[PDB]
């Protein structure tokens, strides 16, 4: 059902924000991470190719995630923000900041913020050539 204890005490989930440069994920799971509460992406909120990673779509996804979590009994979130990682870009996309702000402004409490992009000790070859992509 729901956690019905200590109405004056927070309930903590984990939000896995995958802010790629193509779209963004707002993914709230159980504290362990094994069981997921709700996953809303930028592509299910706006319908066009570029705006999938827009800050607007990210904040809409974060608002929907916060609404669903509040209806499900979760009140606070730990933030585990990631980029694409691997050998590709290590910086988070445009939707990270707006998703985090829309979580912090939609009635949610924020716990620990940490960065979890996958960083190789050394990677395989990148998708480009030795001359890179020339567009």
């Amino acid at each position: 059902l729901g956690p019905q204890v200590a109405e004056g005490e927070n309930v903590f989930g984990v939000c896995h924000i995958f802010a790629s440069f193509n779209d963004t994920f707002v993914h709230v799971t159980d504290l362990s991470g094994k069981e997921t509460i709700c996953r809303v992406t930028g592509g299910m909120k706006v319908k066009a190719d570029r705006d999938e990673s827009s800050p607007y779509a990210a904040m809409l996804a974060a608002q929907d995630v916060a609404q669903r979590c509040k209806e499900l009994g979760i009140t606070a979130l730990h933030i585990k923000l990631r980029a694409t990682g691997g050998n590709r870009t290590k910086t988070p996309g445009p939707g990270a900041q707006s998703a985090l702000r829309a979580l912090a402004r939609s009635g949610m409490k924020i716990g620990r913020i940490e960065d979890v992009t996958p960083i190789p000790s050394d990677s395989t070859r990148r998708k480009g050539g030795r001359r890179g992509r020339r567009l």
Binding site: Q97, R101, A104, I110, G111, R126, G128, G132
Partner: protein, 99 residues
């Protein structure tokens, strides 16, 4: 003509330096020739720091920092305006900008 005395790299006293991939185009550029930036920014931007701080469960959580290392090839470093072309005399100046 010989434009730069160091040939636009930092290879002195060795034959081969391992290459790296430009963060923008994924071009193979020698590690000494590549233009390296190290951005230590805030995970949460200034326009979003205040809202995160109000929503924080812990008082004075001190927000985490994002450490990103960027390697640029010459073309992508010039296009992104990280470095510009300088005069024949200003080219020899190796002082970093004050920032």
């Amino acid at each position: 003509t010989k434009k730069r005395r160091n040939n636009g790299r930092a290879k002195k006293g060795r034959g081969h330096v391992q290459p790296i991939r430009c963060t923008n185009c994924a071009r193979c550029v020698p590690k000494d020739k590549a233009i390296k930036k190290f951005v230590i920014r805030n995970i949460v931007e200034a326009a979003a720091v205040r809202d995160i701080s109000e929503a924080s469960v812990f008082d004075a959580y001190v927000l985490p920092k994002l450490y990103v290392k960027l390697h640029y090839c010459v073309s992508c470093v010039i296009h992104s305006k990280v470095v510009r072309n300088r005069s024949r005399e200003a080219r020899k100046d190796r002082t970093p900008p004050p920032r």
